[PDB]
Amino acid sequence: STGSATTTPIDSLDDAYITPVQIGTPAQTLNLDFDTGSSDLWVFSSETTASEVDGQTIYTPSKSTTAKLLSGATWSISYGDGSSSSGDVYTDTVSVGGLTVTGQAVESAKKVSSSFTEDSTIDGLLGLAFSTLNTVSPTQQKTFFDNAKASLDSPVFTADLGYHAPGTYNFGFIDTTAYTGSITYTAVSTKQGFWEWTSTGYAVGSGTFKSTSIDGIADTGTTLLYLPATVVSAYWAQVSGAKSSSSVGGYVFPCSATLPSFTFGVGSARIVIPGDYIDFGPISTGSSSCFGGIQSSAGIGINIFGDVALKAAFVVFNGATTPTLGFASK
Numbered sequence: 001s002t003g004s005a006t007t008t009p010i011d012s013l014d015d016a017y018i019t020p021v022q023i024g025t026p027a028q029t030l031n032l033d034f035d036t037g038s039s040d041l042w043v044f045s046s047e048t049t050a051s052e053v054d055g056q057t058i059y060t061p062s063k064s065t066t067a068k069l070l071s072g073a074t075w076s077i078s079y080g081d082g083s084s085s086s087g088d089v090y091t092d093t094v095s096v097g098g099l100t101v102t103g104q105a106v107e108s109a110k111k112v113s114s115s116f117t118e119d120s121t122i123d124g125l126l127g128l129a130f131s132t133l134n135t136v137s138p139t140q141q142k143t144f145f146d147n148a149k150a151s152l153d154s155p156v157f158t159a160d161l162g163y164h165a166p167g168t169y170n171f172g173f174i175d176t177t178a179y180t181g182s183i184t185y186t187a188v189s190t191k192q193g194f195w196e197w198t199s200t201g202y203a204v205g206s207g208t209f210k211s212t213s214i215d216g217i218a219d220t221g222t223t224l225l226y227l228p229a230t231v232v233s234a235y236w237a238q239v240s241g242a243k244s245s246s247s248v249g250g251y252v253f254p255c256s257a258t259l260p261s262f263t264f265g266v267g268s269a270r271i272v273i274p275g276d277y278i279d280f281g282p283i284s285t286g287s288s289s290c291f292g293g294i295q296s297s298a299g300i301g302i303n304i305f306g307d308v309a310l311k312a313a314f315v316v317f318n319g320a321t322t323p324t325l326g327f328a329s330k
């Protein structure tokens with residue numbers, strides 16, 4: 001089997017991407033944030049504290065003939081920005097883009113933190129990291145991809161995110177029309193539960209390439225590109241007036257600037273992030289200080305190839321027995 005679904009930016013900055021997901025019978029369609037950096041499929045629901053729901057579409061398990069309470073199971077998760085959610089668990093039929101998993105764990109939120117409430121466009125998350133990170137207790141649950149994998153034509157999914165435009169998540173096949181050149185595959189470590197890999201280095205703008213190993217994760221659920229402070233300083237040093245602001249929370253730059261591109265290495269291949277992809281716009285409406293799309297990972301504990309990097313590429317998440325990641329230009 002295969003599936004294919006369109007993913008759409010939630011706003012004009014590409015702060016996140018949402019993908020429609022059918023849950024239950026009859027289908028209830030919720031727009032979920034597909035997150036290759038976590039492993040829980042959770043939704044706003046009829047159980048979510050009413051004051052914490054503000055415009056999201058909710059899953060109502062009592063209206064689904066295929067829903068069953070997963071008795072005694074609970075979940076609780078926090079994300080890298082400090083947000084969090086928790087609740088209980090149902091199993092139900094979940095379909096993405098025509099690909100169906102029966103008995104998928106659907107984690108129903110009882111509580112969500114303020115950043116979730118405030119984002120009316122995100123009805124929940126669909127985790128695509130390794131199932132070892134799933135938070136359901138006392139019986140850990142599998143991700144949608146892990147549940148689908150044995151049925152897929154090939155044990156893969158691909159992320160083809162757009163820049164200020166829709167893109168595609170495919171399951172079970174590689175669309176050879178969706179990229180240019182070849183896909184370069186690189187080894188993955190699953191030791192921390194992520195799609196963790198080692199980039200071979202970087203270049204700023206037209207500069208020569210610096211060969212250096214950069215361990216990090218491929219994370220569609222993170223907006224920006226978080227890299228070591230050395231690399232990030234070398235980038236922003238090329239932008240007149242750019243500086244790290246402790247009050248804003250990262251590098252800012254004059255909105256009058258045109259940004260250089262940023263290249264990262266995948267083996268002997270290169271992915272070029274155009275400078276415009278690094279512009280996240282005014283820090284507040286009307287400001288002439290703009291927020292940078294490349295930020296330091298210092299203090300996160302891990303480098304993150306988030307959407308700024310991934311949307312420059314066609315990315316293969318290969319979940320074969322020995323997992324790997326593939327990157328192609330597009």
Ligand SMILES: CCCN(C)Cc1nc([C@]2(O)CN[C@@H](c3nc(-c4ccc(C(F)(F)F)cc4)no3)C2)cs1
Nearest residue numbers: 035037038079080083115116119219221222301302
């Ligand atoms: C080894 C150190 C781990 N430490 C915690 C850094 C890391 N963090 C992650 C993520 O938690 C997973 N992938 C990101 C992700 N964030 C979201 C998200 C968050 C908030 C919203 C909201 F604003 F609406 F609330 C929407 C989506 N979705 O995915 C970050 C992987 S490593």
